[PDB]
């Protein structure tokens, strides 16, 4: 069966027909290891990034692209590229960068290289439209039904796919599954989410964004969660007695 012809025939995206779309000790170990959620309201354009310490093992970066507002402050790749991400990234660390589906797939790679990372994975968020069987970008050749989250590394169980139904128009949330994929990597405990929201706050993570309504961040308190004997934990091991 040719699901592209079928999409052309009926408006159902090919991904609608993927079916099916224990690691339980992990997740629990993660949950025991997670620092208390920390969060801080900050206008990141106007905010000295270096003020965020210590250096992060993982950076999830979710800047609000104009394309996320089809029928609705947008950040350009010009703006994003100017962020000093290398200044707060640990010598060995990881970045997860949401790039959309347009020019971001190229400009995002430029950012990763600019900040010092090499891409080692391209995670695709494939959106099903089972509940509503698209106004295209001018340069678009096809209907766009996915978003890419690029994984970069710097220094020395899961699939590279996330399948969910397309969120309602103007819902910019990204699938919470991205967090599961990151946590299951066991990359370390200092985890930063730039351009998060009240809705994305989460144990194990420090969230910085302009729309957060409350803050609780304190550098020294944050730092205390990683002082010895806890400096190098993966996030996937037991707490040290």
């Amino acid at each position: 069966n040719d699901y592209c012809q079928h999409f052309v025939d009926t408006g159902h995206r090919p991904q609608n027909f993927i079916r099916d779309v224990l690691i339980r000790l992990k997740d629990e170990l993660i949950a025991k290891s997670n620092t208390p959620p920390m969060y801080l309201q900050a206008d990141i354009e106007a905010f000295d990034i270096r003020e965020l310490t210590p250096k992060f093992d993982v950076i999830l970066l979710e800047p609000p692209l104009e394309e996320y507002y089809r029928e609705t402050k947008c950040w350009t790749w010009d703006d994003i590229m100017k962020l000093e991400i290398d200044e707060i990234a640990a010598p060995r660390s990881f970045i997860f960068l949401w790039c959309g589906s347009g020019e971001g797939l190229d400009l995002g790679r430029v950012c990763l290289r600019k900040w010092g990372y090499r891409r080692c994975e391209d995670i695709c968020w494939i959106k099903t439209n089972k509940n509503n069987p698209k106004t295209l970008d001018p340069k678009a050749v096809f209907q766009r039904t996915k978003e890419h989250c690029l994984m970069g590394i710097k220094g020395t169980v899961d699939i590279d796919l996330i399948i969910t139904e397309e969120p309602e128009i103007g819902n910019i949330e990204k699938p919470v599954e991205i967090f599961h994929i990151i946590e299951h990597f066991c990359l370390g405990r200092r985890r930063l989410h730039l351009f998060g929201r009240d809705s994305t706050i989460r144990p194990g993570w420090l969230t910085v964004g302009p729309t957060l309504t409350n803050s609780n961040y304190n550098a020294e308190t944050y730092a205390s969660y990683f002082s010895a004997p806890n400096s190098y934990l993966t996030g996937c091991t037991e707490e040290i007695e």
């Binding site: 040719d2 699901y3 592209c4 012809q5 999409f7 052309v8 995206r13 090919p14 991904q15 027909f17 993927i18 079916r19 099916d20 779309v21 589906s101 797939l105 190229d106 790679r109 891409r119 080692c120 994975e121 391209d122 995670i123 695709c124 494939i126 698209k134 295209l136 340069k139 678009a140 050749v141 096809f142 209907q143 766009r144 039904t145 996915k146 890419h148 994984m151 899961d158 699939i159 590279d160 796919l161 994929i181 990597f185």
Partner: protein, 199 residues
């Protein structure tokens, strides 16, 4: 000449100017990253730019070719305007370094000002079953035909199964030279009076 055509050769050495212009180019290169590979400089030197004036390039990538392929695409004079992913399923529609790979990427580039194409008919995801190893899904051709119906199309680094109507297929594992378009057959004989392609 609508029916399949093909040319066993080394694309490194074939004088691709004899082939004329195409509305769509597709390549699935043997990126140097089990068979005859090409080096990055060889990939960069491929004479893609002569093959088109206005049209689309489809370029399969994997691993680090994800970046290298973007470099070649740009070097050859295209802008990447889309990226297709093929989700690999079994016959029962379940999914097959740091993550297991459930997909393959195909970059889409545009050159010039193509007109009369049916942009927006399909979507950038393919869901289809794996056949043999290193075999791209047949659905790409139906996608490419709906995008640009009836036009001349060339595939680079194809294999026997890849031969299609409206397509000329170039590859080194193909069976001789089979050409039916008169304009091509002419320019071939002129450039290659003895049926051998060398330097």
């Amino acid at each position: 000449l609508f029916p399949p055509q093909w040319i066993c050769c080394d694309i490194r050495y074939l004088d691709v100017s004899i082939l004329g212009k195409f509305a769509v180019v597709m390549a699935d290169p043997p990126w140097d990253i089990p068979y005859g590979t090409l080096t990055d400089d060889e990939m960069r030197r491929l004479n893609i730019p002569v093959l088109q004036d206005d049209g689309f390039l489809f370029l399969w990538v994997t691993g680090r070719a994800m970046e290298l392929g973007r470099e070649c695409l740009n070097l050859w004079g295209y802008e990447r305007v889309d990226e297709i992913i093929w989700v690999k399923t079994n016959q029962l529609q379940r999914i097959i370094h740091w993550l297991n790979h459930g997909k393959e990427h195909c970059l889409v580039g545009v050159k010039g000002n193509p007109q009369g194409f049916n942009q927006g008919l399909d979507c950038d995801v393919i869901v289809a079953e794996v056949r043999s190893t290193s075999h791209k899904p047949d659905e790409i051709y139906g996608m490419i035909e709906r995008l640009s119906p009836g036009t001349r199309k060339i595939e680079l680094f194809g294999r026997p199964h890849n031969v299609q109507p409206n397509w000329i297929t170039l590859g080194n594992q193909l069976d001789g030279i089979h050409l039916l378009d008169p304009d091509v057959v002419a320019r071939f004989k002129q450039r290659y009076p003895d049926g051998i392609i060398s330097k």
